[PDB]
Amino acid sequence: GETTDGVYRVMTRRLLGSTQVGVGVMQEGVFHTMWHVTKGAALRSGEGRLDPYWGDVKQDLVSYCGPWKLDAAWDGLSEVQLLAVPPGERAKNIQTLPGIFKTKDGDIGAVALDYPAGTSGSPILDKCGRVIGLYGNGVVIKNGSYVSAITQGKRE
Amino acid sequence: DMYIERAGDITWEKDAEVTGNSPRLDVALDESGDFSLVE
Numbered sequence: 001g002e003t004t005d006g007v008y009r010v011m012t013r014r015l016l017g018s019t020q021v022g023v024g025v026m027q028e029g030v031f032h033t034m035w036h037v038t039k040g041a042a043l044r045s046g047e048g049r050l051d052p053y054w055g056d057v058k059q060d061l062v063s064y065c066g067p068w069k070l071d072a073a074w075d076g077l078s079e080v081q082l083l084a085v086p087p088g089e090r091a092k093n094i095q096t097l098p099g100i101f102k103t104k105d106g107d108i109g110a111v112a113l114d115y116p117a118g119t120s121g122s123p124i125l126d127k128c129g130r131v132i133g134l135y136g137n138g139v140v141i142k143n144g145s146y147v148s149a150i151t152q153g154k155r156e
Numbered sequence: 157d158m159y160i161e162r163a164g165d166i167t168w169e170k171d172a173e174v175t176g177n178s179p180r181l182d183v184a185l186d187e188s189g190d191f192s193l194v195e
């Protein structure tokens with residue numbers, strides 16, 4: 001079906017009407033999204049079928065039609081843009097300076113923006129427009145606000 | 157059941173809405189991929 005590069009909505013008809021469960025990135029013929037969005041299930045693109053190719057619950061990532069292609073990284077200094085694709089609303093770029101998630105295994109960038117849960121999978125971009133990660137797996141802080149990790153996979 | 161629909165191109169947009177803070181949080185990542193606050 002549709003294999004053009006870009007940001008896509010991930011929809012279902014199992015619930016009431018058509019519901020947006022998440023978002024993904026098509027790049028180099030590979031569809032990239034977060035594991036919690038699809039739970040590794042197959043996807044439909046018009047009349048075509050996309051089968052899962054790689055996935056990992058711990059990283060909360062899954063790729064379709066091929067291996068993970070997104071290899072850009074946050075430089076740890078510069079501002080970035082969340083290309084938010086919220087449910088029933090137009091794609092919108094939001095500029096922000098990432099914070100940090102300090103873990104025993106190393107530090108990861110974090111974006112402090114609040115969108116509905118169906119926004120999971122929206123890409124995070126650097127100044128050249130390269131995807132440095134996906135938005136949607138993170139934590140809730142004391143004021144009920146949501147902070148997401150900048151979740152990036154590994155390219156072979 | 158699940159299906160994809162195109163939503164846009166992946167580009168950086170000059171003069172976009174600038175919002176959001178930069179918090180430093182101590183976190184733990186479990187086997188199920190869940191992040192949690194360590195304070």
Ligand SMILES: NCc1ccc(C[C@H](NC(=O)c2ccccc2)C(=O)N2CCCCC2)cc1
Pocket residue numbers: 036114115116117118119120135136137138139140146188189190
């Ligand atoms: N294994 C269970 C499980 C854990 C984590 C997720 C992802 C979830 N994403 C959002 O809620 C979200 C909100 C706004 C925008 C984008 C995504 C999340 O990070 N939390 C859910 C529970 C609260 C804090 C962790 C799903 C399933």
